[PDB]
Design a binder for these strands. Structure first.
Lengths: 349, 188, 217
RNA sequence: ACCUGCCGCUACCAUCCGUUGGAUAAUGGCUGAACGCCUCUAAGUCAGAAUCCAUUCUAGAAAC
RNA sequence: CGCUCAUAGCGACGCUGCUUUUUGAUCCUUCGAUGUCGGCUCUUCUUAUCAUUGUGAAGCAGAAUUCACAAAGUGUUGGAUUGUUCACCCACUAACAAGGAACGUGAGCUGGGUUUAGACCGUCGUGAGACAGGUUAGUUUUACCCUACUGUUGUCAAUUGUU
RNA sequence: CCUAACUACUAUACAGCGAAACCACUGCAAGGGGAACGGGCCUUGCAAAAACAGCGGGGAAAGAAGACCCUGUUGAGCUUG
RNA sequence: AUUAGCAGUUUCGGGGGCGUAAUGCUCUCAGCUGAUUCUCAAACUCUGAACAUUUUUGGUAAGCAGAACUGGCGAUGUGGGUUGAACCAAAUAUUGGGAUAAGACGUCUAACAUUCACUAAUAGAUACCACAAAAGGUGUUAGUUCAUUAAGACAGCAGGACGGUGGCCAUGGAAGUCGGUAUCCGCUAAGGAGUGUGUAACAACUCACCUGCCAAAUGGACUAGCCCUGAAAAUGGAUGACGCUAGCAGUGGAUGGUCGAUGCCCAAUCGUUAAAAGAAGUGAUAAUACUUUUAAC
């Protein structure tokens, strides 16, 4: 047969096709914006944590668009964004099949992130106690030399670099004795600068404000709401028998036909609809939220004009169950991937 | 079946220095210099003294022969041009809807503004080395001078292409910028 | 035959049928005419003859032939006129084509459409020609050669396959070359016949003869 | 049974989000022969598709 | 013919192909049983491109239309009636182009036709009965095997370091 | 239209308890030729233990020596001038 | 079966022109006759031929159906054609070596060099065989014929391109060129009562036509190799694959050379057959229902 309809537009997209349980529990992307910026001011990525949604009335910004100064409501995804603690500098060098781990360098002041990935690990256990056997930086004076050696070499030898950062989730509402590690590739200026200043920053702690300005779009990442295995119906948006007289199923009819005389990838089937990656882009960012030292609350109201009160963005009752903002946060444009209490990640556009 | 190819000789005036490093020309005259690449077809190319370059290749075909003829011709033009600069003048045609032609003198960029109703800004960056200037002939004409004939002409053509109406009749408008006075030189 | 596509018959095969007391049910030939231009033209004025030949051995349909003749009969007029073309074609269609009809079927069959009683009924009259065998032939004046070759050329399109055009070396519709034609006039052996030449020749089919020179002279 | 009904799932029965570079085809030109002129072509080159391939996104190899 | 003007657009009589989306012809395959027709579902592919992207012709002034290249990247509708593809109307749309996949798609459905028995008519038959005639009612079984797909563990049932 | 949610129950995991039909051998594909639609032949694409739960494209799946149709000097039930 | 005109007829057929009209002549057209012309007539023939290949009937055809002769396949395989019942070589006891057949020889895959061309194509790559045609190409190669050329060519650029004359007509404008018909002569180096563009039609410009210069080849109509266009369809795909290209490993040749079957040669071993022999290496045995020799398979 012709078909004979036309439409059948591929229910779904083959650009998310493997649609399996994603690799990283956190938001993760294997891609970055390229080099045309200043230096450490442009860190590129950041890591936040979701904590629900509210709505915000503002005015439009478009002429000829139901007034450029008329009010419209919109939702927003508010997201507790604790400041991060960079700790490794890591040097990639560009080679005949992409980039590789030449060699990292790590800060001497801290090595508790290492430890944090340990209590939750091992099974025979020779080196839980506190030690190592995938090679990590200890020592005051002798290791210093090694660090120095590393630093120069990476700086000289090719290609760009990133910083092993991580979150401070202990101080977050949700308790976790492991924290989330991340790369924030550094763009702009020159390699010498880039390599150098990472070392300086180890002790220092970056802020979401450090990365983004209040009117900047986002390359948002996360891991989608883990619904679990479910059949071809709302996994691909198919159809059914609405007047209903069928002894088969909710599940679809032909799966390929006697056509290539086997069944194809390109057929919607019973699998799972949750932890997947993806990336949504161009999110306006409406307001960077301030830190709260357990005294003031005007800081999480925003303005006092038009706001016309003093309150946290947190609701009347607040969050006793869910992720409660006590920290820096972010008002985006509405909707981000991932459930209400998830480890997102952010990139600039 | 396979026939020998005659050499094609060209006299060079004493204004210029044709050097030829490994079958690849550079011709330095008053207006400046033009290089160019050859040995496409494996041809030989020699200097006798310094008033005679000659191209040849002593076996081959019609195909090869043609190529020999071409290369020589190309170099002759270059020789002419780098000593006496080439001039391709393009006149434009509209005064029913009047036309607005503009010129960035610094970067050597023509910018055509309003023709056939358009409100757009059509900016065409000229090719390497060549230039243009606005000239009062009859409240008309952009004059494009340059020493690489190949390049200047190409640039002009590009401009011509860009200044026409790509939807609906080709004779409702005859309008746009087109070439007028070409193969023109100067010694003033 | 205009019903069929003529791919069906453009290969000379099957021993050749005819009109007769045996094949009665034939249609009438498409061309029943072999007369293009001035037939009442003398042999001593149109000294050129051009010929068209089938390059390929094949059948040659009556309809096709007919079509061809009006590439040499519209084109008779635009170039020269009636006082140049004298054509006898030089092929006819004696041969017939049969058609075992199964057109009956347009939805189902009666089974008589099948190969029982297969033998087809007469439908399509056609010619058979080798490669030499000549198919058009214009006897003409020798100021008309390119304005008659293009008639032939035109005709060639309307024949299947490859078709060669030519000019002979004779006065056309004669055995005798242009070299041996002047002999006839000179030696007093030219005998006119309004179209043909008989050509006077001494011989003996009698008892004691002398009128064999004095007959036509 | 009925009304109301958070949390939770879910609706064009709601809300948000869907990029930029090269390479070309056709085709339109350039310089320019073979073919003293000529010609987009032969040598050569320019512009140029919802096209191609990258960037993006998914997955992540008995690959590091 | 297209005023005029063979090829803008068509194109006679005539001639050559391709196609397998028509139907025949054939009877190789299957009667140790490939479940026959349509509709729904769903993908895939083809291009002989209806729309759109970019181009070039036009009897292309504009408008709209027509013709053609590249190109199958994205679209390709809602309904009455019909068992029905086919058919024919109403309505939208940029457009509602033709096709293929065992006349795609029955352990995916439905059974509206076609397919048995019961039965009504009409024509035919002395009659039992017949009908590519009409009418009506008529049980659609099985995946707990291998593969293929979807997701889900786990592994070089160690490649000769753990983690 | 356009699907949604919810509960029961089965399924799904365990614990006991345990089954058949089927089964030449066997299970990756494209193309080729070949009882003309190959899993095996040929040439290419390739290839990675053991498995789970779904799904129904393939095994010209299974159930039935098709009774549709023809044949056999095979029958029967009925009809008639 | 059937085409053409010609002649000789016309008290025989018909209608015209010539005295009114005919057949009285002369015409186109009827009939008859005579000589010539077209295609010759499976069931005509004076004459008369030596599954595959060849012949051949039906059939548009069919991997359809039906015959003939030979060959195979089928009741024999092997090598070769990628693969394959039938095509090629060539037939199989079991082996050894040697040399071949068809087919190959860049690599897969045993097997090579040398030489001349041709093709530049998303190609082109061994019968059967996995299709391609009519018709096009100022693609390149190779030819063939006629024309032109130092009396100066060809292309190029430059000059000239007239008088009668506004040719007669239509018009009262169409003055070469909306357009009909004649289409001549002068003079010249040459110039159509004109090839278009243009214009009210002209004017103006250009073309045929000629000459200035430059300076050696030019022009054309065809044939025919390879290539291209023609040349569109359904999972992802086929010289078998890779791949190849400016000698190629493609095509068409040339001169050698090599690989290679269960074929052939030679040797061996076993059986079969035919012939012969007997103390069977059974030279003290005493075997013939058995063993041996020779030859062929």
């Amino acid at each position: 047969m012709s078909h004979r309809k036309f439409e059948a537009p591929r229910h779904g997209n083959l650009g998310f096709r493997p649609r399996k349980r994603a690799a990283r529990h956190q938001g993760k992307v294997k891609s970055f914006p390229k080099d045309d910026r200043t230096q450490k001011v442009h860190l590129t990525a950041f890591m936040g944590y979701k904590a629900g949604m509210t709505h915000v009335v503002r005015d439009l910004e478009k002429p000829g668009s139901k007034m450029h100064k008329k009010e419209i409501v919109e939702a927003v995804t508010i997201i507790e964004c604790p400041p991060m603690y960079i700790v490794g500098l890591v040097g990639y060098v560009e080679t005949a099949q992409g980039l590789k781990t030449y060699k990292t360098v790590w800060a001497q002041h801290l090595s508790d992130n290492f430890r944090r990935r340990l209590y939750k690990n091992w099974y025979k256990s020779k080196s839980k106690k506190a030690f190592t056997k995938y090679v990590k930086q200890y020592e005051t004076e002798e290791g210093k030399k090694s660090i120095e050696a590393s630093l120069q070499a990476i700086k000289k030898r090719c290609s760009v670099v990133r910083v092993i950062a991580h979150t401070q989730v202990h101080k977050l509402k949700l308790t976790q004795k492991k924290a989330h590690v991340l790369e924030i590739q550094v763009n702009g200026g020159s390699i010498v600068e880039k390599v150098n200043f990472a070392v300086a920053n180890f002790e220092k702690t970056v802020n979401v404000t450090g990365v983004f300005a209040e009117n900047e779009l986002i390359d948002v990442i996360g891991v989608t709401k883990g619904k679990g295995f479910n059949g071809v119906i709302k996994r691909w948006g198919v159809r059914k028998l609405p007047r209903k007289t069928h002894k088969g199923l909710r599940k679809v009819a032909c799966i390929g036909a006697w056509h290539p005389s086997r069944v194809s990838t390109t057929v919607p089937r019973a699998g799972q609809l949750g932890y997947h990656h993806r990336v949504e882009r161009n999110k306006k960012i409406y307001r960077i939220g301030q830190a709260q030292p357990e005294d003031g609350k005007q800081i999480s109201t925003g303005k006092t004009e038009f706001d016309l009160t003093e309150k946290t963005i947190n609701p009347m009752g607040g969050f006793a169950h869910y992720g409660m903002v006590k920290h820096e946060f972010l008002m985006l444009k509405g909707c981000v991937a991932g459930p209400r209490k998830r480890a997102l990640t952010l990139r600039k556009s | 079946m396979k026939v020998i190819n005659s050499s094609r000789k060209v006299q060079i005036p004493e204004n210029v220095t044709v050097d030829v490093k490994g079958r690849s020309v550079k011709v330095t005259g008053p207006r400046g210099t033009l290089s160019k690449s050859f040995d496409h077809a494996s041809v030989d190319i020699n200097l006798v003294g310094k008033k005679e370059l000659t191209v040849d290749l002593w076996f081959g075909n019609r195909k090869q022969i043609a190529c020999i003829k071409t290369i020589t011709s190309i170099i002759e033009n270059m020789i002419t041009g780098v000593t006496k600069g080439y001039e391709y003048k393009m006149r434009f045609v509209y005064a029913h809807f009047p036309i607005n032609v503009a010129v960035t003198d610094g970067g050597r960029v023509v910018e055509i503004r309003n023709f056939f109703g358009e409100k757009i800004v059509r900016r065409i960056e000229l090719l390497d080395g060549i230039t243009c200037y606005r000239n009062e002939k009859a409240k008309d004409e952009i004059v494009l001078t340059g020493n690489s004939l190949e390049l200047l002409s190409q640039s002009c053509a590009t401009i011509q292409l860009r200044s026409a109406i790509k939807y609906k009749d080709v004779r409702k408008f005859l309008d746009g910028i087109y070439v007028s006075e070409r193969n023109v030189l100067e010694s003033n | 035959m205009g019903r069929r596509p003529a791919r069906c018959y453009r290969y000379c095969k099957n021993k050749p049928y005819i009109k007769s007391r045996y094949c009665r049910g034939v249609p009438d030939a498409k061309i029943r005419i072999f007369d293009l231009g001035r037939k009442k033209a003398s042999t001593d004025e149109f000294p050129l003859c051009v010929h068209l030949i089938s390059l390929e051995k094949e059948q040659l349909s009556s309809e096709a032939i007919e079509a061809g003749r009006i590439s040499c009969n519209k084109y008779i007029s635009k170039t020269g006129g009636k006082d140049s073309f004298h054509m006898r074609v030089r092929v006819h269609p004696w041969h017939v084509l049969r058609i075992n009809k199964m057109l009956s079927c347009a939805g189902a069959d009666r089974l008589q459409t099948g190969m029982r009683g297969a033998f087809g009924k007469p439908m399509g009259t056609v010619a058979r020609v080798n490669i030499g065998q000549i198919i058009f032939s214009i006897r003409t004046r020798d100021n008309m050669l390119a304005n008659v070759v293009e008639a032939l050329r035109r005709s060639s399109y309307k024949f299947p396959g490859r078709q060669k055009i030519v000019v002979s070396k004779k006065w056309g519709f004669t055995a005798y070359n242009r070299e041996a034609y002047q002999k006839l006039k000179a030696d007093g052996r030219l005998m006119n016949d309004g179209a043909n030449v008989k050509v006077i020749t001494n011989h003996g089919t009698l008892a004691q003869y002398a009128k064999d020179i004095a007959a036509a002279n």
